[PDB]
């Protein structure tokens, strides 16, 4: 994506009803800090999800260690809060060649103060004045009270610790809802007239697969015989009517 917002108004995208391309995530390998939870990153290729929350923002190259489920520091204190029990992956890389511009980048912002720690996954766009001391400023700025937000200072004159990271966070769950977003798997070349173990679409058995002229209705999957055996199946990748003997 071409434009991530800051952490005071981070973008959140509910994603479901599609398939996961988890391969090139690991094959990317241009990513600085790439960690995961729940169960191992190699294991998560197939172990799939009801409803994922993909929310992303841009933070500094020093504060990214604050982004960890159950830590402190400003981004996890007042800006964006990972929960106490978390599943997803933190994906983090540098975008110094895009974000930090000569003449100064000050598009980006963050919240520096709030009268409590931040509830998990809840943004804070309320840019009203907080009153640290007791003297009421009441919307306008003044004494004992500061402005809530502040920018970052990004230029390519910054050191490597001050480079902008485009942290995207993937968060996962599991419910009475089905695994609506789920990773695909590779196929096996069809064998005709060979005793061959098989799986089609999760249907499993062992038989001799042949070409067959029995004619399905389109929505259908299996055929069956009188005996409630699985007699004939249709190849999902190339539609064809395959007997099972």
């Amino acid at each position, epitope marked *: 994506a071409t434009r991530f917002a800051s952490v005071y108004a981070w973008n959140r995208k509910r994603i479901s009803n599609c398939v996961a391309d988890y391969s090139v995530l690991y094959n990317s*390998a241009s*990513f*600085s*800090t*790439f*960690k995961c939870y729940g169960v191992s990153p190699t294991k998560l290729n197939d172990l799939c999800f009801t409803n994922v929350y993909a929310d992303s923002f841009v933070i500094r*190259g*020093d504060e*990214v*260690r604050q982004i*960890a489920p159950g*830590q402190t520091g400003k981004i996890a204190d007042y800006n964006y809060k990972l929960p106490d029990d978390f599943t997803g992956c933190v994906i*983090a890389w540098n975008s110094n060649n895009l974000d930090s511009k000569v003449g100064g980048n000050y598009n980006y912002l963050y919240r520096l103060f709030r009268k409590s720690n931040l509830k998990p996954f809840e943004r804070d766009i309320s840019t009203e004045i907080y009153q640290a001391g007791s003297t009421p400023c009441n919307g306008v700025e003044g004494f004992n009270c500061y402005f809530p937000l502040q920018s970052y200072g990004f230029q390519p004159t910054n*050191g*490597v*610790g001050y480079q902008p990271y485009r942290v995207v966070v993937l968060s996962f769950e599991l419910l009475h809802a089905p695994a609506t977003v789920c990773g695909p798997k590779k196929s096996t070349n069809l064998v005709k007239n060979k005793c061959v173990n098989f799986n089609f679409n999760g249907l499993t058995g062992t038989g001799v697969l042949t070409e067959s002229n029995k004619k399905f209705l389109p929505f259908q999957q299996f055929g069956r015989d009188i005996a409630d055996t699985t007699d004939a199946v249709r190849d999902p990748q190339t539609l064809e009517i395959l007997d099972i003997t």
Partner: antibody, heavy 118, light 108 residues
């Protein structure tokens, strides 16, 4: 628990000097062991491994002098012979171990000076 | 080729009660295989963090590690008068292992 080293000293270049380092408290045998180098004012530079649990020897190609490494497992001791010397290797050596996400066994010897000079 | 390390800064003269972030950057994407050491000059390197995110016996949480991939972080917090020494990061990803050049935290 504890690592002891063979004696360091001043050796002329091109020569050889076997390095002995004996363990105590727990055996060498079940683990690997390493050697590292510290020149004065210089960072800690890894030298070579030993791997007793099969048998394999890896050397740094940065200092690739065929500094040979093998065992005396029954004495919990390890031998790396200083071969093909050159003066910039004049430093202190350490017997080492790396916590490879599983163990916490990083135990370090006392440090002895190898000197390469005429 | 070899795996390059990048330890930054290579020194930082510090004061009492600080929170110093000694960064060890990597040339490749290393999973978590990075460590940290205490060395007063002439001592044995006392291990501080293993797998870049886990504390060690005898060493309280005034030290605190995090990071993965290329980016690794030494999170020294509430800087103590004994913590001023020469420190080191560490790969164990491939062979050869290299160590960082060291970061001497010292009294201002």
């Amino acid at each position: 628990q504890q690592l002891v080293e063979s004696g360091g000293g001043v050796v002329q270049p091109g020569r050889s000097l076997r390095l002995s380092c004996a363990a105590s408290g727990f055996t060498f045998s079940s683990y690997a062991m390493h050697w590292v180098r510290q020149a004065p004012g210089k960072g800690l530079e890894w030298v070579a491994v030993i791997s007793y649990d099969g048998s394999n020897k890896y050397y740094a190609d940065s200092v690739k002098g065929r500094f040979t490494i093998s065992r005396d497992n029954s004495k919990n001791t390890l031998y790396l012979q200083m071969n093909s010397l050159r003066a910039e290797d004049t430093a202190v050596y350490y017997c080492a171990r790396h916590a490879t996400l599983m163990n916490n066994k990083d135990i370090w010897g006392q440090g002895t000076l190898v000197t390469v000079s005429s | 080729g070899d795996i390059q390390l990048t330890q930054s800064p290579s020194s930082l003269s510090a004061s009492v009660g600080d929170r110093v972030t000694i960064t060890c950057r990597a040339s490749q994407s290393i999973s978590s295989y990075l460590n940290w050491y205490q060395q007063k000059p002439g001592k044995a390197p006392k291990l501080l963090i293993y797998a870049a995110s886990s504390l060690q016996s005898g060493v309280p949480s005034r030290f605190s590690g995090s990071g993965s991939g290329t980016d690794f972080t030494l999170t020294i917090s509430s800087l103590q008068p004994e913590d001023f020494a020469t420190y080191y990061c560490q790969q164990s990803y491939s062979t050869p292992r290299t160590f960082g050049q060291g970061t001497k935290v010292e009294i201002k």
